[PDB]
């Protein structure tokens, strides 16, 4: 259709544009536009085109509107070749009919409601009133009043009317539907009595409010009766319109929308590019080749194994450029051992999380609902669940390996020579727990420390690469320069870590280590010296975060002592299962906390990443929140 000399649109990160542009040139494409800046020159546009487009928009919108009144909206699937005019035409009869039913249907509901409310008090008024509704010789005034209010209005009336009214009420509960009958002559005084009071007349909607009550009542009664049945019919028809028309609506929708995009596309490019990515034009010899591949860096719109699997997807995301310094990707293969490896549980902690994974590949029945995680049906976005199968793999793996460092843990919390712990007793493994014991514990703590060290190096090294390959001497020196300090830092720790080694051995070396630092920090000149203290907080942080990942972990395993070996009396094999009153609970409590746990790692990681150590999402900047990023 439109773009008769025919469009391809590619979209993306701003930096990639030249490389993208090159990929597009290769494909078989011709007449590549705009190519920096914008504003095509005899390949633009006219409102005629726009008008026709407007017609597609009208249909598009219309299909949605009608779909709306019914309820739901369509999904990307099968458009189909149409007349645009045809599409517009198509929409009209069906929509109007459905819309018509809708229009009646709300009106019916309202009718039903109103009628229901009014009929009974009005009936009460009518019953008192008869003979005198008619008369305008005499006048009668309906109003409803409640039974406290029965003295207050009665006083207002009494003052005006005296006794020249005879004053009537009929009950219907919640008050009595009331009449004053007065002479017609007395009418203002009577109405005024209501006015002083603030008591209100049962005037009702429409013609009905105005009426002789008895007669009015008949009509009102009829509405009450009629409306639910009427509603049923209309509702059936509407329901009927969904059942049949939902596919129809969709096909139209898909078409109309796509067309709307398609049309739009032509219009924006016509004028003025994607932005920083790239359009262009093909004769139909050029047209088949071009779309299919042209290397992932971009989004277009058309006219061992565990370790490979999400990473494989990160290989492409390596390839998106911006600079000669290396790009986002690393996070997923970097996380995994520790991620899993905070989880260091036992029979009742870690080792049952498989069941949950088995409820993501098998499911559950025993409470309300779940059916298939692959079909990800939900209380809050379904969609996501289908997408995050990449995550479903990593999670199934997370538990599996996590269970396993729990089982590493139960090597050292079973076996009778290693600790006092049973090899496999009459209660349960991991029984009178002892990794808590300070010396044993000390080792597990110190275990945590190491991963933090890795991170110190990994980040600053990447800074030196930043300036290396983005060429900034400023970045280079900054990333490199801090390492000048480091030998001396290692000295100071060591004098306590070995209690000896340095700090008075390599502390003479400290005297020279401190100067080396400030040399190239000084080469940039840098009044921006002070910061170096703050860097000192960070190292310790790695330790602490890991430390907690251990400690809170460890604590968790030691909580299964007070979960399942003991928690009232001392827990043997019956009071043990008097703890099982609590035991089921502890699983769900355990569930809550562990969501908490993982996020520290990533926070940790983010400290490094968004100090621009390998990552060009960071406080914005193309690429997008890391939250969204790593998951594929």
- Nearest Cα to Cα of residue 558 among 434, 407, 455, 475: 434
CA distances 495 to 439, 453, 500, 504, 522, Å, are 20, 17, 4, 7, 29
Q: Which CB atom, from 195 or from 523, has the smaller least distance to other proteins?
A: 195
Q: Tokens at residue 616, please? A: 């060009």
- Total residues at interface with other proteins (CB under 8 A): 11
| Minimum gap (Å) between residue 42 Cβ and other proteins | 4
| Minimum gap (Å) between residue 471 Cβ and other proteins | 24
Q: Which CB atom, from 102 or from 392, has the smaller least distance to other proteins?
A: 102
- Nearest Cα to Cα of residue 280 among 10, 11, 7: 7
| Minimum gap (Å) between residue 106 Cβ and other proteins | 12
Q: Which CB atom, from 34 or from 102, has the smaller least distance to other proteins?
A: 34
| Minimum gap (Å) between residue 528 Cβ and other proteins | 27
d(CA 579, CA 523): 67
Tokens 């995009």 belong to: 261
Q: Which CB atom, from 195 or from 361, has the smaller least distance to other proteins?
A: 195
Q: Do 271 and 44 contact (CB within 8 A), yes or no?
A: yes
Q: Tokens at residue 380, please? A: 């809050």
Residues 166-205, one symbol each (x = binds other proteins by CB under 8 A, - = not), give -----------------------------x--x-------
| Minimum gap (Å) between residue 97 Cβ and other proteins | 23
Q: Do 624 and 383 contact (CB within 8 A), yes or no?
A: no
At residue 431's C-alpha, the angle toward residues 427 and 432, to 5°, is: 135
Give the SS3 label for residue 170. Answer: strand
| Minimum gap (Å) between residue 41 Cβ and other proteins | 5
Torsion of the alpha carbons at 514, 520, 525 and 529, rounded to the nearest 10: -40
| Minimum gap (Å) between residue 32 Cβ and other proteins | 8
d(CA 238, CA 219): 28
d(CA 384, CA 106): 35
Residues 276-315, one symbol each (x = binds other proteins by CB under 8 A, - = not), give ----------------------------------------
- CA end-to-end span of the chain: 36
Instruction: Tell me the chain's radius of gyration from C-alpha atoms.
Output: 39
| Minimum gap (Å) between residue 158 Cβ and other proteins | 20
66, with CB counted inside 10 A (0-12, 13-18, 19+), is buried
Q: Please, which residues bridge with residue 167 across strands?
A: 180
Q: Please, which residues bridge with residue 142 across strands?
A: 179
42: how many CB neighbours lie within 10 A of its CB?
4
| Minimum gap (Å) between residue 237 Cβ and other proteins | 24
| Minimum gap (Å) between residue 201 Cβ and other proteins | 11
Q: Which CB atom, from 149 or from 631, has the smaller least distance to other proteins?
A: 149
| Minimum gap (Å) between residue 228 Cβ and other proteins | 24
Subset of 9-48 contacting other proteins (CB under 8 A): 31-36, 41-43
| Minimum gap (Å) between residue 264 Cβ and other proteins | 13
d(CA 370, CA 381): 14
What single DSSP character describes residue 278?
A: B
Name the phi and psi angles at 80, rounded to 5.
-165, 150
Subset of 42-61 contacting other proteins (CB under 8 A): 42-43
Peptide bond into 264 cis (omega under 30): no
Subset of 432-471 contacting other proteins (CB under 8 A): none
Q: Which CB atom, from 61 or from 520, has the smaller least distance to other proteins?
A: 61
| Minimum gap (Å) between residue 53 Cβ and other proteins | 15
Q: Which CB atom, from 261 or from 483, has the smaller least distance to other proteins?
A: 261
Q: Which CB atom, from 28 or from 578, has the smaller least distance to other proteins?
A: 28
Give 3-state DSSP helix, strand, coil % of the chain, rounded to 5: 60, 5, 35
Subset of 54-113 contacting other proteins (CB under 8 A): none
Q: Which CB atom, from 41 or from 304, has the smaller least distance to other proteins?
A: 41
Q: Which CB atom, from 264 or from 434, has the smaller least distance to other proteins?
A: 264
Peptide bond into 34 cis (omega under 30): yes
Give, for 206, the enclosing helix (H) or strand (E). Answer: helix 206-210
Give me the half-sphere count of Cα atoms (radius 13 Å) on the Cβ side of residue 301.
17
Q: Which CB atom, from 33 or from 617, has the smaller least distance to other proteins?
A: 33
| Minimum gap (Å) between residue 420 Cβ and other proteins | 58
Q: Which CB atom, from 35 or from 532, has the smaller least distance to other proteins?
A: 35
Alpha carbon 556 to chain centroid, angstroms: 30
Q: Which CB atom, from 156 or from 334, has the smaller least distance to other proteins?
A: 156
The H-assigned helical ranges of 498-631 are 507-521, 532-558, 561-564, 580-597, 599-609, 626-629
Q: Which CB atom, from 30 or from 242, has the smaller least distance to other proteins?
A: 30
* Contacting residues toward other proteins, per CB under 8 A: 31-36, 41-43, 195, 198
């Amino acid at each position: 259709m439109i773009a008769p000399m025919e469009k391809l649109v590619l979209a993306g990160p701003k930096g990639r544009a030249k490389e993208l542009l090159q990929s597009l040139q290769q494909a078989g494409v011709v007449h590549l536009e705009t190519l920096r800046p914008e504003a095509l020159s005899a390949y633009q546009l006219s409102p005629e085109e726009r008008a026709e487009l407007r017609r597609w928009e009208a249909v598009s919108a219309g299909a949605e509107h009608t779909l709306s009144l019914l309820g739901l909206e369509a999904e990307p699937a099968r458009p189909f070749p149409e007349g645009l005019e045809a599409a517009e035409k198509a929409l009209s009869p069906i929509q109007a009919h459905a819309e018509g039913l809708t229009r009646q249907k709300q009106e019916l509901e309202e009718e039903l409601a109103l009628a229901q409310a009014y009929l009974e008090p009005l009936e009460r008024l009518a019953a008192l009133a008869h003979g005198l509704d008619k008369s305008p010789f005499l006048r009668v005034i309906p109003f409803l009043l409640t039974e406290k209010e029965l003295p207050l209005v009665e006083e207002a009336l009494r003052k005006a009317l005296e006794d020249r009214y005879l004053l009537a009420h009929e009950a219907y509960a919640g008050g009595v539907a009331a009449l004053v009958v007065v002479h017609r002559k007395e009418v203002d005084q009577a109405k005024a009595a209501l006015s002083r009071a603030g008591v209100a007349e049962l005037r009702l909607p429409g013609a009905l409010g105005e009426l002789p009550l008895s007669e009015a009542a008949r009509r009102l009664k009829e509405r009450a009766e009629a409306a639910p049945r009427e509603l049923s019919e209309v509702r059936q028809h509407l329901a009927k319109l969904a059942r049949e028309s939902a596919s129809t609506l969709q096909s139209l929708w898909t078409r109309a929308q796509d067309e709307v995009a398609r049309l739009k596309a032509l219009e924006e490019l016509a004028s003025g590019r994607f932005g920083f990515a790239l359009l262009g034009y093909v004769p139909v010899k050029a047209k088949p080749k071009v779309e299919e591949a042209l290397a992932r860096h971009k989004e277009s719109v058309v006219y061992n194994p565990p370790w490979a699997k999400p990473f494989e997807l990160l290989v492409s995301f390596l390839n998106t450029p911006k600079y000669g310094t290396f790009d986002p990707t690393p996070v997923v293969p970097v996380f995994f051992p520790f991620w899993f490896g905070m989880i260091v549980g036992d029979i009742g902690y870690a080792l049952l999380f498989y069941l949950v994974g088995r409820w993501l590949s098998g499911y559950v029945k025993r409470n309300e609902p779940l059916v298939i995680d692959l079909f990800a049906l939900k209380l809050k976005p379904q969609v996501i669940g289908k997408l995050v199968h990449i995550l479903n793999w990593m999670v199934f793996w997370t538990v599996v390996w996590g269970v396993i460092y729990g089982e590493f843990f139960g090597t050292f919390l079973e076996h009778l020579g290693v600790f006092g712990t049973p090899e496999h007793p009459g209660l349960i493994p991991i029984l009178i727990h002892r990794i808590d014991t300070a010396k044993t514990a000390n080792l597990l703590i110190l275990l945590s420390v190491a991963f933090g060290v890795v991170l110190v190096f990994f980040g600053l090294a990447l800074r030196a690469y930043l300036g290396l390959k983005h060429r900034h001497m400023a970045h280079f020196w900054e990333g490199v320069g801090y390492l000048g300090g480091l030998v001396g830092v290692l000295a100071l720790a060591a004098s306590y870590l070995g209690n000896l080694q340095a700090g008075w051995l390599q502390g003479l070396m400290y005297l020279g280590f401190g100067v080396f630092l400030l040399a190239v920090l000084m080469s940039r000149i840098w009044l921006m010296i002070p910061e170096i203290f703050t860097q000192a907080g960070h190292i310790l942080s790695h330790i602490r975060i890991y430390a907690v990942g251990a400690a809170g972990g460890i604590l968790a395993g030691l909580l299964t002592d007070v979960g399942f070996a003991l928690a009232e009396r001392l827990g043997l094999l019956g009071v043990l299962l008097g703890l099982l009153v609590a035991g089921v609970l502890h699983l769900l409590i355990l569930l809550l906390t562990t969501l908490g746990h993982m996020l520290q790692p990533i926070r940790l990681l983010w400290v490094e990443f968004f100090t621009k150590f390998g990552f060009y999402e960071e406080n914005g900047r193309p690429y997008r929140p890391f939250k969204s990023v790593r998951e594929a």
